[PDB]
Design a protein around this ligand. Sequence first.
Ligand SMILES: NC(=O)c1c(-c2ccc3scnc3c2)nn2c1N[C@H]1C[C@H](C[C@@H]1O)C2
Length: 279
Amino acid sequence: AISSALPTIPYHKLADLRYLSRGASGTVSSARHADWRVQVAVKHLHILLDSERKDVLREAEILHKARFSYILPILGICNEPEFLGIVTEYMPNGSLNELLHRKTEYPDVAWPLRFRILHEIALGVNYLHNMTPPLLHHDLKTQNILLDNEFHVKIADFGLCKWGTIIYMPPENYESIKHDIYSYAVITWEVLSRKQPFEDVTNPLQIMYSVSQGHRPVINEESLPYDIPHRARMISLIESGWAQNPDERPSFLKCLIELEPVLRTFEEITFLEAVIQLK
Ligand SMILES: NC(=O)c1c(-c2ccc3scnc3c2)nn2c1N[C@H]1C[C@H](C[C@@H]1O)C2
């Protein structure tokens, strides 16, 4: 049984600790490690409770166990009297949300990159489902799909995972291994549309009411234009992914088997050309 312990990092090694974003999960800051000479991110708490400390230790244990090419690499934990935080690689290219919706900043996200992003999310979630015991993310949303310096996907935010918005939640969870694939489908719709799901709906409960009656983000020529590569296959994958009956949604293994032939139609250089075009 080959084991490794998550390193502990003294707070004083984390220089230039500057705020990046607050959230529900906690506050995320950028720093640089004095010994290692690389920029890092730290997720920490707003400046010392008991079961708050339990939650962070849990998430850090998970990240450490879930290490994978498409999962945010934990570098260590800061564990001290005054300060508690998870230290990971800094993701300089933001989240997928920002990529899709900041259209002035990113007017062209070429198709090959979008497909790669969808492929890599799938590979990341699939890995988690294939752990023993399976880890279910249960909070997949475009905000939690971070993008590295090369625009590769790192999945983040393991606060609601089991060994804010409801747009990505399947109808049955309003009061299951088929949750993540539902979230995935909506993300797939979002990525291919660059639209907000249910854009023309004021109230979340109106969405929930509609979703529980079988309605889904709209699929027409306006949402998903006719020039999308593999439009028809992608629409099937979306529609099965978010099917009303959870039993009718695919496993991520099935999903990946559907994606592989699509991803193979993109030459490797077109991903690089896609990334270079971006800000
Ligand atoms: N690693 C990062 O760079 C992060 C993290 C982050 C850090 C540590 C942990 S431990 C569990 N999940 C996380 C997520 N969140 N964000 C990041 N990057 C950009 C987008 C926003 C803020 C930044 O502009 C969100």
